[PDB]
Design an enzyme around this catalytic site. Structure first.
Site, PDB file in Angstrom:
ATOM      1  N   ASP A  35       6.362  30.707  67.918  1.00 14.95           N
ATOM      2  CA  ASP A  35       7.424  29.835  67.551  1.00 14.95           C
ATOM      3  C   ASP A  35       8.910  30.198  68.014  1.00 14.95           C
ATOM      4  O   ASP A  35       9.384  31.173  67.161  1.00 14.95           O
ATOM      5  CB  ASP A  35       7.298  29.911  65.972  1.00 14.95           C
ATOM      6  N   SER A 199      21.679  18.908  75.777  1.00 20.87           N
ATOM      7  CA  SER A 199      20.946  17.976  76.840  1.00 20.87           C
ATOM      8  C   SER A 199      22.264  17.095  77.118  1.00 20.87           C
ATOM      9  O   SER A 199      23.025  16.743  76.351  1.00 20.87           O
ATOM     10  CB  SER A 199      19.838  17.387  76.182  1.00 20.87           C
TER      11      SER A 199
END
Length: 330
Positions: A35, A199
């Site tokens: 994770d 992004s």
């Protein structure tokens, strides 16, 4: 040194991925959920409340010659999905894919919430976010990667998750045969303890790419792609019959639909998520309504590039002094 381990989806939807990890001496192999959105390595154990264990493989520290109890230490974690676990703390020898860390903090669960009990395939978590998020008290402990870093050939790990198929976590090297084209690297902020990046925009299907900054985290421990409501609405508007259902808990669509791809930007480069990756199957057994793999992050407080996004890429988690993230198509 390096390590290389295969990671395998737990079910036919890729809800999560498990990677075998050797703990203790002699080795006890547990299948952990790696994770990159958390920083605790915790396991089901001989100390876990019996009624809360249902099919998991447990770690038994009394059978390990190398286990050490960290005196007085405790841990307690709550995850974004509302699940939780807590317990006490050992250190022990931990190996992943041939890479060994001695003295790794192995957090032994005394209690786990129902979602963990109900998932027999996951024996615990191995956190790969920054050690600043680790929950051990009174003294925070380091992640497996943090402990291994100095010994690695290069201070990196890579995630290469499969679509409905196994993939690979590598430590200490980049497998240049595992991707197409080049890797584009992008800046990371560690201010919140995550692999947080920005992004450069998105496209829906064959639509023209929209340049816009989207801050979010690269999180292998989250199944879906969670993005701003504007972006998500633009995606689902291109799917006939799709709608947001408050009762189901997100966007749903007719299972007969042909889903468009979704593209996200990494600098000037682009990662294309095929439409099929966005299908998470019937909302309930036998339903003709299906659950979408791109959902709104509104009310989470952060955008999450979870497995839906990451499995479309070869992803480099660069833990150099100034961390960065790399993405390549594959």
């Amino acid at each position: 040194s390096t390590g290389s381990a295969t990671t395998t989806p737990i079910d036919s939807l890729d809800d999560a991925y498990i990677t075998p990890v050797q703990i203790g001496t002699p080795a006890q192999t547990l299948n952990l959920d790696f994770d990159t959105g958390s920083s605790d390595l915790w396991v089901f154990s001989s100390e876990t409340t019996a009624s809360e264990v249902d099919g998991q493989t447990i770690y038994t520290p009394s059978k390990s010659t190398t286990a050490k109890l960290l005196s007085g230490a405790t841990w307690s974690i709550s995850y974004g999905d509302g699940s939780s676990s807590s317990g006490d703390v050992y250190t022990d020898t931990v190996s992943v894919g041939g890479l060994t860390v001695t003295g790794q903090a192995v957090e032994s669960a005394k209690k786990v919430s129902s979602s963990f009990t109900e998932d027999s395939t996951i024996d615990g978590l191995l956190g790969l976010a920054f050690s600043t998020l680790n929950t051990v008290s009174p003294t925070q402990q380091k992640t497996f990667f943090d402990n291994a870093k100095a010994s690695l050939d290069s201070p990196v790990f890579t995630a290469d998750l499969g679509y409905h198929a196994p993939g690979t976590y590598n430590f200490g090297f980049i497998d240049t045969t595992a991707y197409t084209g080049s890797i584009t690297y992008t800046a990371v902020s560690t201010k919140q303890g995550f692999w947080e990046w920005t992004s450069t925009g998105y496209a829906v299907g064959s639509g023209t790419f929209k340049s816009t900054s989207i801050d979010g985290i690269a999180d292998t421990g989250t199944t879906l792609l969670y993005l701003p409501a504007t972006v998500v609405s633009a995606y689902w508007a291109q799917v006939s019959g799709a709608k947001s259902s408050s009762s189901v808990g997100g966007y749903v669509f007719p299972c007969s639909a042909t889903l468009p791809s979704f593209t996200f930007g990494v600098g000037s480069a682009r990662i294309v998520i095929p439409g099929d990756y966005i299908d998470f199957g019937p909302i309930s057994t036998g339903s003709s309504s299906c659950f979408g793999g791109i959902q709104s992050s509104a009310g989470i407080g952060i955008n999450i590039f979870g497995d839906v996004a990451l499995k479309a890429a070869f992803v480099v988690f660069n833990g150099a002094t100034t961390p960065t993230l790399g993405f390549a198509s594959k």
